[PDB]
Protein backbone atom coordinates (compact mmCIF):
# COMPACT_ATOMS: atom_id res chain seq x y z
CA UNK A 1 0.00 0.00 0.00
CA UNK A 2 2.61 2.48 1.20
CA UNK A 3 5.45 0.26 2.42
CA UNK A 4 5.50 -2.39 -0.28
CA UNK A 5 3.43 -4.87 -2.29
CA UNK A 6 1.66 -7.71 -0.53
CA UNK A 7 0.71 -11.39 -0.99
CA UNK A 8 -2.07 -12.59 -3.30
CA UNK A 9 -4.10 -15.55 -1.90
CA UNK A 10 -4.10 -18.16 -4.66
CA UNK A 11 -7.16 -20.38 -5.06
CA UNK A 12 -7.72 -24.12 -5.41
CA UNK A 13 -8.59 -25.94 -8.64
CA UNK A 14 -12.12 -27.00 -9.49
CA UNK A 15 -13.75 -30.29 -8.40
CA UNK A 16 -14.92 -31.12 -11.94
CA UNK A 17 -12.46 -29.85 -14.53
CA UNK A 18 -9.70 -29.05 -12.01
CA UNK A 19 -9.08 -25.51 -13.23
CA UNK A 20 -7.76 -22.59 -11.24
CA UNK A 21 -9.59 -20.41 -13.76
CA UNK A 22 -12.89 -22.17 -13.11
CA UNK A 23 -12.75 -21.45 -9.38
CA UNK A 24 -11.54 -17.92 -10.07
CA UNK A 25 -14.68 -17.46 -12.17
CA UNK A 26 -17.10 -19.10 -9.74
CA UNK A 27 -15.91 -16.62 -7.13
CA UNK A 28 -16.72 -13.69 -9.43
CA UNK A 29 -20.41 -14.53 -9.60
CA UNK A 30 -21.07 -15.07 -5.91
CA UNK A 31 -23.01 -12.31 -4.18
CA UNK A 32 -23.46 -12.03 -0.40
CA UNK A 33 -21.81 -15.09 1.09
CA UNK A 34 -23.95 -17.51 -0.93
CA UNK A 35 -21.78 -19.83 -2.99
CA UNK A 36 -23.53 -23.05 -4.01
CA UNK A 37 -25.93 -21.14 -6.25
CA UNK A 38 -22.98 -19.73 -8.18
CA UNK A 39 -21.49 -23.19 -8.70
CA UNK A 40 -24.85 -24.37 -9.99
CA UNK A 41 -25.25 -21.66 -12.60
CA UNK A 42 -21.62 -22.24 -13.61
CA UNK A 43 -22.14 -25.95 -14.22
CA UNK A 44 -25.47 -25.48 -15.98
CA UNK A 45 -24.02 -22.81 -18.25
CA UNK A 46 -21.10 -25.14 -19.01
CA UNK A 47 -23.41 -27.98 -19.99
CA UNK A 48 -25.45 -25.63 -22.18
CA UNK A 49 -22.26 -24.51 -23.90
CA UNK A 50 -21.12 -28.06 -24.55
CA UNK A 51 -24.58 -28.97 -25.83
CA UNK A 52 -24.63 -26.86 -28.98
CA UNK A 53 -21.26 -27.16 -30.74
CA UNK A 54 -19.76 -29.61 -28.30
CA UNK A 55 -16.02 -29.08 -28.11
CA UNK A 56 -15.32 -28.32 -24.42
CA UNK A 57 -16.51 -25.99 -21.66
CA UNK A 58 -12.82 -25.16 -21.21
CA UNK A 59 -11.35 -24.68 -24.67
CA UNK A 60 -14.01 -22.33 -26.05
CA UNK A 61 -13.75 -20.60 -22.68
CA UNK A 62 -10.06 -19.86 -23.16
CA UNK A 63 -10.85 -18.82 -26.73
CA UNK A 64 -13.29 -16.19 -25.50
CA UNK A 65 -10.70 -15.19 -22.90
CA UNK A 66 -7.81 -14.59 -25.29
CA UNK A 67 -10.39 -12.66 -27.30
CA UNK A 68 -10.80 -10.33 -24.29
CA UNK A 69 -7.63 -10.03 -22.20
CA UNK A 70 -6.12 -6.68 -23.29
CA UNK A 71 -2.51 -5.61 -23.81
CA UNK A 72 -2.43 -1.88 -22.97
CA UNK A 73 -4.31 0.52 -20.71
CA UNK A 74 -4.57 4.25 -20.17
CA UNK A 75 -3.07 4.98 -16.75
CA UNK A 76 -3.85 8.51 -15.63
CA UNK A 77 -0.66 10.03 -14.22
CA UNK A 78 0.10 13.66 -13.41
CA UNK A 79 3.83 13.70 -14.00
CA UNK A 80 3.13 17.08 -15.58
CA UNK A 81 0.41 17.67 -13.01
CA UNK A 82 -2.12 17.64 -15.82
CA UNK A 83 -4.56 15.24 -17.46
CA UNK A 84 -1.81 13.09 -18.96
CA UNK A 85 -3.00 9.53 -19.52
CA UNK A 86 -0.06 7.35 -20.53
CA UNK A 87 -0.51 3.92 -22.15
CA UNK A 88 0.78 1.28 -19.76
CA UNK A 89 2.21 -2.19 -20.35
CA UNK A 90 -0.51 -4.14 -18.57
CA UNK A 91 0.64 -6.93 -16.27
CA UNK A 92 -0.09 -10.62 -16.84
CA UNK A 93 -2.45 -11.23 -13.91
CA UNK A 94 -4.56 -8.07 -14.18
CA UNK A 95 -5.23 -9.16 -17.75
CA UNK A 96 -7.09 -12.26 -16.57
CA UNK A 97 -8.73 -10.21 -13.84
CA UNK A 98 -10.21 -7.81 -16.36
CA UNK A 99 -11.14 -10.66 -18.64
CA UNK A 100 -13.36 -12.24 -16.03
CA UNK A 101 -14.66 -8.87 -14.89
CA UNK A 102 -15.82 -7.69 -18.30
CA UNK A 103 -17.16 -11.14 -19.13
CA UNK A 104 -19.37 -11.55 -16.08
CA UNK A 105 -20.48 -7.93 -15.69
CA UNK A 106 -21.24 -7.17 -19.31
CA UNK A 107 -22.90 -10.58 -19.63
CA UNK A 108 -25.17 -9.79 -16.68
CA UNK A 109 -26.93 -7.34 -19.02
CA UNK A 110 -27.44 -9.81 -21.88
CA UNK A 111 -31.07 -10.31 -20.92
CA UNK A 112 -32.31 -13.88 -20.98
CA UNK A 113 -35.12 -14.26 -18.48
CA UNK A 114 -33.57 -17.67 -17.88
CA UNK A 115 -31.04 -17.91 -15.09
CA UNK A 116 -27.75 -18.81 -16.80
CA UNK A 117 -28.46 -18.55 -20.52
CA UNK A 118 -26.97 -15.07 -20.16
CA UNK A 119 -23.44 -16.29 -19.45
CA UNK A 120 -23.28 -19.22 -21.85
CA UNK A 121 -24.36 -17.21 -24.86
CA UNK A 122 -21.94 -14.46 -23.90
CA UNK A 123 -18.77 -16.52 -23.80
CA UNK A 124 -19.85 -18.46 -26.89
CA UNK A 125 -20.29 -15.19 -28.76
CA UNK A 126 -17.01 -13.82 -27.45
CA UNK A 127 -14.98 -16.82 -28.62
CA UNK A 128 -16.11 -15.85 -32.14
CA UNK A 129 -15.35 -12.12 -31.75
CA UNK A 130 -18.96 -10.94 -31.63
CA UNK A 131 -20.03 -8.98 -28.56
CA UNK A 132 -19.08 -5.81 -26.76
CA UNK A 133 -16.50 -7.46 -24.49
CA UNK A 134 -14.49 -8.07 -27.64
CA UNK A 135 -15.47 -4.54 -28.59
CA UNK A 136 -14.42 -3.49 -25.09
CA UNK A 137 -10.90 -4.85 -25.54
CA UNK A 138 -10.67 -3.37 -29.01
CA UNK A 139 -11.87 -0.03 -27.63
CA UNK A 140 -9.20 -0.16 -24.95
CA UNK A 141 -6.61 -0.81 -27.66
CA UNK A 142 -8.09 1.96 -29.81
CA UNK A 143 -7.83 4.50 -26.99
CA UNK A 144 -4.36 3.19 -26.29
CA UNK A 145 -2.06 4.31 -29.10
CA UNK A 146 -4.72 6.91 -29.68
CA UNK A 147 -2.40 9.10 -27.61
CA UNK A 148 0.83 7.11 -27.38
CA UNK A 149 2.52 10.05 -29.12
CA UNK A 150 2.86 12.41 -26.15
CA UNK A 151 2.55 9.74 -23.48
CA UNK A 152 5.27 7.17 -24.07
CA UNK A 153 8.68 8.47 -22.98
CA UNK A 154 7.61 8.09 -19.35
Amino acid sequence: PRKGPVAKRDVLPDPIYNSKLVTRLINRVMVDGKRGIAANIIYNSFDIIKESTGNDPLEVFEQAMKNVMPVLEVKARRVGGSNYQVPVEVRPERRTTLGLRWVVNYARLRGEHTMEERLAKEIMDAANNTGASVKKREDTHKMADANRAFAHYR
Partner: protein
Protein backbone atom coordinates in the same frame (compact mmCIF):
# COMPACT_ATOMS: atom_id res chain seq x y z
CA UNK B 1 12.00 11.51 -61.38
CA UNK B 2 15.32 12.25 -63.10
CA UNK B 3 16.99 10.07 -60.45
CA UNK B 4 19.40 12.50 -58.86
CA UNK B 5 20.34 10.01 -56.10
CA UNK B 6 22.52 12.56 -54.30
CA UNK B 7 21.22 15.24 -51.97
CA UNK B 8 20.93 16.71 -48.49
CA UNK B 9 18.31 16.58 -45.72
CA UNK B 10 17.65 19.51 -43.38
CA UNK B 11 16.27 19.29 -39.84
CA UNK B 12 14.79 22.24 -37.95
CA UNK B 13 12.90 21.72 -34.70
CA UNK B 14 11.82 24.31 -32.15
CA UNK B 15 10.48 23.72 -28.67
CA UNK B 16 7.03 23.33 -30.21
CA UNK B 17 7.36 21.82 -33.70
CA UNK B 18 9.58 19.87 -36.06
CA UNK B 19 10.27 19.82 -39.79
CA UNK B 20 12.45 17.84 -42.18
CA UNK B 21 13.04 18.75 -45.82
CA UNK B 22 15.14 16.74 -48.27
CA UNK B 23 16.60 18.37 -51.39
CA UNK B 24 19.60 17.93 -53.66
CA UNK B 25 23.01 19.45 -52.98
CA UNK B 26 22.00 22.88 -54.29
CA UNK B 27 19.27 22.16 -53.40
CA UNK B 28 16.01 22.56 -55.25
CA UNK B 29 13.24 21.27 -53.03
CA UNK B 30 12.36 17.59 -53.40
CA UNK B 31 10.27 16.31 -50.48
CA UNK B 32 9.40 17.39 -46.94
CA UNK B 33 7.10 16.58 -44.05
CA UNK B 34 6.17 17.84 -40.61
CA UNK B 35 4.20 16.85 -37.55
CA UNK B 36 1.89 19.72 -38.40
CA UNK B 37 0.76 17.95 -41.55
CA UNK B 38 0.59 14.46 -40.07
CA UNK B 39 -2.57 15.33 -38.13
CA UNK B 40 -0.93 15.93 -34.77
CA UNK B 41 -1.81 19.15 -32.99
CA UNK B 42 -0.23 21.79 -30.85
CA UNK B 43 0.58 20.37 -27.43
CA UNK B 44 2.07 17.20 -28.96
CA UNK B 45 4.07 18.32 -32.01
CA UNK B 46 7.21 18.56 -29.84
CA UNK B 47 7.53 14.90 -28.97
CA UNK B 48 10.15 12.31 -29.97
CA UNK B 49 7.44 10.39 -31.79
CA UNK B 50 6.35 13.12 -34.19
CA UNK B 51 9.97 13.21 -35.31
CA UNK B 52 9.86 9.54 -36.27
CA UNK B 53 6.70 9.87 -38.29
CA UNK B 54 7.71 13.09 -40.05
CA UNK B 55 11.03 11.53 -41.03
CA UNK B 56 9.28 8.45 -42.40
CA UNK B 57 6.56 10.27 -44.30
CA UNK B 58 9.33 12.25 -45.94
CA UNK B 59 11.92 9.58 -46.75
CA UNK B 60 9.49 6.96 -48.04
CA UNK B 61 8.53 9.48 -50.72
CA UNK B 62 11.92 11.05 -51.41
CA UNK B 63 13.74 7.80 -52.12
CA UNK B 64 11.19 6.98 -54.83
CA UNK B 65 12.67 9.57 -57.19
CA UNK B 66 16.02 7.82 -56.74
CA UNK B 67 18.13 8.57 -53.69
CA UNK B 68 20.40 6.41 -51.56
CA UNK B 69 22.82 8.61 -49.63
CA UNK B 70 22.05 12.00 -48.13
CA UNK B 71 23.64 14.67 -45.99
CA UNK B 72 22.15 15.85 -42.72
CA UNK B 73 21.50 19.42 -41.57
CA UNK B 74 20.54 19.87 -37.91
CA UNK B 75 19.27 23.24 -36.71
CA UNK B 76 16.68 23.66 -34.03
CA UNK B 77 17.39 23.00 -30.36
CA UNK B 78 14.51 20.66 -29.54
CA UNK B 79 13.76 17.04 -28.80
CA UNK B 80 13.53 15.17 -32.12
CA UNK B 81 17.16 15.80 -33.00
CA UNK B 82 17.93 12.24 -31.91
CA UNK B 83 14.94 10.25 -33.12
CA UNK B 84 14.97 11.86 -36.55
CA UNK B 85 18.38 10.68 -37.72
CA UNK B 86 17.99 7.13 -36.43
CA UNK B 87 14.53 6.95 -38.01
CA UNK B 88 16.08 7.99 -41.30
CA UNK B 89 18.58 5.16 -40.86
CA UNK B 90 15.70 2.81 -40.00
CA UNK B 91 13.63 2.95 -43.19
CA UNK B 92 16.69 2.22 -45.32
CA UNK B 93 18.80 5.27 -46.10
CA UNK B 94 22.47 6.15 -45.93
CA UNK B 95 22.99 8.87 -43.33
CA UNK B 96 26.73 9.36 -43.69
CA UNK B 97 27.89 12.77 -42.44
CA UNK B 98 26.36 14.72 -39.55
CA UNK B 99 27.03 18.43 -39.08
CA UNK B 100 25.36 20.58 -36.44
CA UNK B 101 24.64 24.12 -37.58
CA UNK B 102 22.88 26.27 -35.00
CA UNK B 103 22.82 30.02 -35.67
CA UNK B 104 24.89 31.75 -32.99
CA UNK B 105 25.39 35.51 -33.30
CA UNK B 106 28.44 37.55 -32.37
CA UNK B 107 26.25 39.67 -30.05
CA UNK B 108 24.51 42.09 -32.34
CA UNK B 109 20.86 41.51 -31.47
CA UNK B 110 18.39 42.33 -28.72
CA UNK B 111 16.42 39.29 -27.55
CA UNK B 112 12.92 39.83 -26.17
CA UNK B 113 12.03 40.38 -22.52
CA UNK B 114 12.06 37.61 -19.96
CA UNK B 115 8.73 35.95 -19.23
CA UNK B 116 7.12 36.29 -15.79
CA UNK B 117 5.12 33.22 -14.87
Amino acid sequence: KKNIESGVAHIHSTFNNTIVMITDTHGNALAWSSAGSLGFKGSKKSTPFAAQMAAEAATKVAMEHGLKTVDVTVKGPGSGREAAIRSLQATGLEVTAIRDVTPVPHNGCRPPKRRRV
